[PDB]
Amino acid sequence: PVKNSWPELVGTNGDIAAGIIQTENANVKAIVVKEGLPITQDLNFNRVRVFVDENRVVTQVPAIG
Predict the structure, then answer these.
(1) What is the CATH classification number for the domain harbouring 26?
(2) Nearest-angstrom CA–CA distance, 34 and 27
(3) Torsion angle of alpha carbons 39, 43, 45, 49, nearest 10°?
(4) Would residue 50 be called left, alpha or beta, if left means φ above 0 and alpha means ψ between -120 and 50 degrees?
(5) Sorted alphabetically, which PROSITE patterns does this protein's record hold?
(6) What is the span of the domain harbouring residue 50?
(7) C-alpha closest to that of 30 among 12, 41, 54, 1
């Protein structure tokens, strides 16, 4: 089963986390986004949103969707 969530990257730099994610799961694009960005309920299994704070630290567990 391919890895689809990265709890161990919470608290890390989001741009570094995006690189790791795209290496561990070859079928996803990782996107660093500011936490709280309004998103619709569109499920994109090839996307991992990496939610970060004002210092670009990951604040939520990244997962596909």
Answers:
(1) 3.30.10.10
(2) 23
(3) 10
(4) beta
(5) POTATO_INHIBITOR
(6) 7-64
(7) 12
